[PDB]
Amino acid sequence: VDEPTVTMTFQVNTSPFAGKEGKFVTSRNILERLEKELVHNVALRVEQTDDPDKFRVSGRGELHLSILIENMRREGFELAVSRPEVIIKEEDGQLMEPFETVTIDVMEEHQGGIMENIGLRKGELKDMAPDGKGRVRMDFIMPSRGLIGFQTEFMTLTSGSGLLYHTFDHYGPHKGGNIGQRVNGVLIANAAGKALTNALFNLQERGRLFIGHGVEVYEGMVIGIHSRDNDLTVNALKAQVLTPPIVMTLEQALEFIDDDELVEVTPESIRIRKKFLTESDRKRAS
Amino acid sequence: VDEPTVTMTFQVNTSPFAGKEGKFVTSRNILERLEKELVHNVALRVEQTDDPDKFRVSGRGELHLSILIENMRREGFELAVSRPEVIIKEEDGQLMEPFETVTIDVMEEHQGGIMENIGLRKGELKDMAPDGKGRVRMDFIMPSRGLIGFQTEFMTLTSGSGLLYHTFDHYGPHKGGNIGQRVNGVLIANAAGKALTNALFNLQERGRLFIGHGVEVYEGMVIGIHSRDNDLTVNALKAQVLTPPIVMTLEQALEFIDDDELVEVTPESIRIRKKFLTESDRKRAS
């Protein structure tokens, strides 16, 4: 009830663009701000680590943490954050994960598709009620792990007409299932400079871009989603109508990144990057 | 009365140690803090420059500015500052500098030496009063330019027994005179690492050191005063009793540095450095 269910690391921005966009950049700025938050935010936990620049921050759910990050961005912070992961607990030798009660309200026509998606996310139907007017309310239990990314898919699957509400309920046996996972790789800049249309016009053929002409990139910055499952390290710098790029919400960024990535946040920007900025360091790490 | 008489530049710390000691490091932290100060500090002026990291800060006198810098250090700032210089004004084709009324109270035995030093600093005696008990009060007019460094010399020349008070009085014709000047060069570290006794034991023969064994240095950091007037670039890193080093007050640091130097300030430290960190860049600059 105090107790958190999701954790991430918050750390000093070490990108090549660090310091160019926010006024609060130091580890002590971050720690003091997290300590200010603990004064009054009861589900939050903050742990120091062996790195003075990095803090393990846990909260009631992902939204609790993304709200804090957004407040900090607005106050003038730069930082980088790792992917949210559910806190695993053990009880009498059983490994356990957090589960949420989920209420949805959708048009009858979307019911089948929603149930299918929820079942893939290890969800279980507990109750339902049609309104007799074309909509239906349904109550589910779902692991928090399977709620990651769900809001966006739910909006697609309901064409923006569905309502979704969820909150932590209990810890219970881990469900397994490869539910926390994107199936596409990323396009990664190989060098720093201003991105150019000619380079991006060719790259937009390999996937969807996050950037357009003239955006400043750095080596290791993620600039798009690959249509295949592997990562491509690419040159952004070399009629050519560019398709409008994907702009992700902070929450979508947090839900997209893998373990080898970070979301870099500033009062002005959300950037995704690899943890290891050069291709050779990512090769050596793999 | 609002109007300032001394100016310096305050800027983002760009040393190799930057960020390791203070929590407020960005240009916007510095600007916001200077803007906070202007709200209530009427003799202060703050101008932006062509460099977003650098601000021209003017005040009633040097002490006004060193008080502000000390408050900022204590609040958690890192910054670097240039030497104070008097603001020159022009009136009807005449170039003018600030002058102060100066009152001193000294033992009769120190009178001659003080008068001699004050005359070298373009000072003029206006009034005096012995107390009949062995002390004398004297009133002088001195350019602010000639007050730079005076407090320290006055304390030496009176063996700590003298009293000195001064405040701005008027602008008047520039006196000339090479009064703002140290006659010794500096010893400059040629490489980064922990200073070692063996290296410093030899260097303490060339001058007076600001550091002792184990102090972390960086290339371009000033580590001592040369007994001669030229700068020496030296290796700090290579019974050996070291003489206790010179520790300068912030004010003494500000009064010591030349135009090619900065005082680097943090909540923990006062360091002097060259503006150009490598010997080859200082050669090219000269």
CATH code of the domain covering residue A41: 3.30.70.870
Beta-strand (E) ranges in B92-206?
94-107, 124-130, 135-143, 163-173, 186-189, 193-194
Q: Are B128 and B105 in contact (CB under 8 A)?
A: no
Residues in a beta bridge with B172: B97
Six-digit token string for A75: 């106050």
Count CB-CB contacts under 10 A for residue B80. Answer: 23
CB burial of residue A63 (10 Å; 0-12, 13-18, 19+): middle
- Chain A with chain B: Cβ pairs closer than 8 A: 23
The reply to whether residue B25 touches residue A26, judged by beta carbons under 8 angstroms, is yes
Q: How far apart are CA B144 and CA B87, in angstroms?
A: 10
Q: How far apart are CA B128 and CA B138, in angstroms?
A: 4
Nearest to B100 by CA among B86, B79, B80, B81: B86
Say if residue B131 is in the same domain as residue B53: no
Residue B167 DSSP one-character state? E
Say if residue B123 is in the same domain as residue B60: no
Q: How far apart are CA B35 and CA A187, in angstroms?
A: 43
Q: How far apart are CA A152 and CA B59, in angstroms?
A: 56
Resolution, Å (one decimal): 2.0
Q: How far is CA A68 from CA A43, A57, B120, B258, in A?
A: 12, 10, 62, 47
Pairing of strands A6-11, A85-86: antiparallel
Most A-contacting residue of B11, B13, B23, B36 (CB-CB within 10 A), to test interface: B23
Q: Which domain holds residue B194?
A: 182-247+276-286
Say if residue B204 is in the same domain as residue B114: no
Domain count, chain A: 3
The reply to whether residue A29 touches residue B22, judged by beta carbons under 8 angstroms, is no
Say if residue B169 is in the same domain as residue B257: no
Say if residue B122 is in the same domain as residue B201: no
Say if residue B187 is in the same domain as residue B283: yes
Q: How far apart are CA A271 and CA A248, in angstroms?
A: 10
Query: How far does the CA of residue B29 sit from the closest CA of chain A (Å)?
Result: 6
Say if residue B113 is in the same domain as residue B166: yes
What is the secondary structure of chain A as a DSSP string?
A: -----EEEEEE---STTTTSS-SB-SHHHHHHHHHHHHHH-TT-EEEE-SSTTEEEEEESSHHHHHHHHHHHHHHTB-EEEPPPEEPPEEETTEEEEEEEEEEEEEEGGGHHHHHHHHHHTT-EEEEEEE-SSSEEEEEEEEEHHHHTTHHHHHHHHTTT--EEEEEEEEEEE----S-S-----EEEESS-EE--HHHHHHHTTSEEES--TT-EE-TTEEEEEESSSS-EEE-S----PPPPPP---HHHHHHH--TTEEEEE-SS-EEEEESS-SHHHHHHH-
Say if residue B174 is in the same domain as residue B220: no
What is the secondary structure of B76-115 as a DSSP string?
A: TB-EEEPPPEEPPEEETTEEEEEEEEEEEEEEGGGHHHHH
Say if residue A19 is in the same domain as residue A71: yes
The reply to whether residue A26 touches residue B28, judged by beta carbons under 8 angstroms, is no
Six-digit token string for B143: 């350019």
Q: Are A24 and A78 in contact (CB under 8 A)?
A: yes
- Encode burial over A214-231: b for 16+ CB neighbours within 10 A, e otherwise: ebebbbbbbbbbbeeeeb
User: Which CATH number fits the domain that encloses residue A229?
Assistant: 2.40.50.250
Q: How far apart are CA A32 and CA A12, in angstroms?
A: 13
Q: How far apart are CA A15 and CA A56, in angstroms?
A: 20
Six-digit token string for B94: 């005449």
Count CB-CB contacts under 10 A for residue B89. Answer: 15
Q: Are A12 and B7 in contact (CB under 8 A)?
A: no
The reply to whether residue B29 touches residue A22, judged by beta carbons under 8 angstroms, is no
Q: How far apart are CA A124 and CA A143, in angstroms?
A: 10
Say if residue B187 is in the same domain as residue B174: no
**Angle formed at CA B186 by CA B276 and CA B14, multiple of 5 degrees:** 30
Domain end among B181, B213, B234: B181
The reply to whether residue B26 touches residue A28, judged by beta carbons under 8 angstroms, is no
Q: Which amino acid is at A75?
A: E
Q: How far apart are CA B153 and CA B188, in angstroms?
A: 25
Q: Whose structure tokens read 């249509």? A: A227
The helix/strand/coil state of B126 is strand
Residue B24 DSSP one-character state? B
Domain end among B159, B181, B203: B181
Six-digit token string for A200: 């991006």
Nearest to A29 by CA among A61, A52, A63: A52
Residues in a beta bridge with A9: A56
Count CB-CB contacts under 10 A for residue B43. Answer: 17
Residues 6 or more apart in contact with residue A231 via CB below 8 angstroms: A185, A186, A187, A188, A282
Say if residue B188 is in the same domain as residue B210: yes
Q: How far apart are CA B124 and CA B119, in angstroms?
A: 7
Q: Are A116 and A123 in contact (CB under 8 A)?
A: no
**Angle formed at CA B137 by CA B135 and CA B141, multiple of 5 degrees:** 150
Nearest to A224 by CA among A241, A242, A237, A206: A206
Say if residue B50 is in the same domain as residue B94: no
User: Which CATH number fits the domain that encloses residue A147?
Assistant: 3.30.70.240
Q: Whose structure tokens read 């460094």? A: B149
Nearest to A69 by CA among A275, A200, A262, A230: A262
CB contacts of A14 in chain B (<8 Å) are none
Residues 6 or more apart in contact with residue A106 via CB below 8 angstroms: A114, A135, A136, A138, A158, A161, A162, A163
Domain end among A181, A204, A235: A181
